[PDB]
Design a protein around this ligand. Structure first.
Ligand SMILES: Nc1ncnc2c1ncn2[C@@H]1O[C@H](CSCC[C@H](N)C(=O)O)[C@@H](O)[C@H]1O
Lengths: 7, 243
């Protein structure tokens, strides 16, 4: 659902 | 003459004499990048950059820094992005980043352009900045992947993006973090960064030693199942079948 890069 | 240094977790810092109120306000305040050498010296109000000129921290004696200005008329100012404005000067590069990375054709097949190192550096070195417009997670998560190639979560409330046509260096080069391609064996990570021009953003920091001309990669970190762009899922499978 989360359509962004993450760290 | 009581000089103050304020260091951020990322390695950058603010240095100068505070006013009667105890704030970084004056014509001789400076932001020093993580290399503790590259700096933006000039007018700041309460720590906020009004007019910073490219300079070099030559030396420090008992906490007192000595800066010498770099040639040229390169001035910068706090220019935080909004949801619709990425930068007041999209074609003015960042001086620290300009000396560390460059864009070229990626070594990854069919990956377009990539970000490369200009120098050999050790682990934990900040190399590039990931600035962009600020939008909500709802806006991002509720739209097609075709529009989320450059989205990067900043925090629980904000997502940074470099939308068309800013994804083209000819249109935007203030920062270049969005040009780093993905890898499941990355040599860099996205880390928090407090920039004097861009404000709170993220940076690309090395995980280990990198050589001059080595391509910088970061793990995009999309959700996985033991949603993401097709190219990502493909490379994921290919990765699982080696190691
Ligand atoms: N490992 C990889 N394999 C194939 N394409 C990749 C990739 N990592 C990144 N990309 C490509 O780069 C996009 C993210 S932005 C990275 C910059 C981009 N290559 C450019 O030239 O502007 C993705 O949408 C995808 O098209």
């Amino acid at each position: 659902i989360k359509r962004s890069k993450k760290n | 003459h009581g000089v103050c240094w304020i260091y951020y977790p990322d390695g950058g810092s603010l240095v100068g004499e505070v006013n009667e109120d105890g704030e970084m306000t004056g014509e001789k305040i400076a932001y020093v990048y993580p290399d503790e050498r590259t700096a933006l010296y000039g007018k700041f109000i309460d720590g906020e950059m009004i007019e910073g000129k490219l300079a070099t921290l030559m030396s420090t004696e008992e906490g007192r820094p000595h800066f010498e200005l770099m040639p040229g008329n390169s001035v910068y100012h706090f220019d935080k992005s909004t949801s619709s404005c990425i930068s007041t000067n999209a074609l003015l590069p960042d001086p620290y980043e300009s000396e560390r990375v460059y864009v070229a054709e990626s070594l990854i097949s069919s990956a377009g352009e990539g970000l490369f190192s200009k120098v050999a550096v050790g682990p934990n070195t900040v190399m590039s900045f990931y600035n962009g417009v600020r939008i909500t997670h709802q806006e991002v998560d509720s739209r097609d992947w075709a529009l989320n190639g450059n989205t990067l979560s900043l925090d629980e409330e904000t997502v940074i993006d470099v939308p068309e046509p800013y994804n083209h260096v000819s249109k935007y080069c203030a920062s270049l973090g969005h040009k780093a391609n993905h890898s499941f064996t990355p040599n860099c990570i996205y880390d928090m960064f407090v920039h004097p021009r861009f404000g709170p953003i993220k940076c690309i920091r090395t995980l280990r030693a990198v050589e001059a001309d080595e391509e910088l990669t970061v793990a995009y970190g999309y959700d996985h199942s033991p949603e993401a762009p097709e190219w990502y899922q493909v490379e994921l499978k290919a990765f699982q079948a080696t190691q």
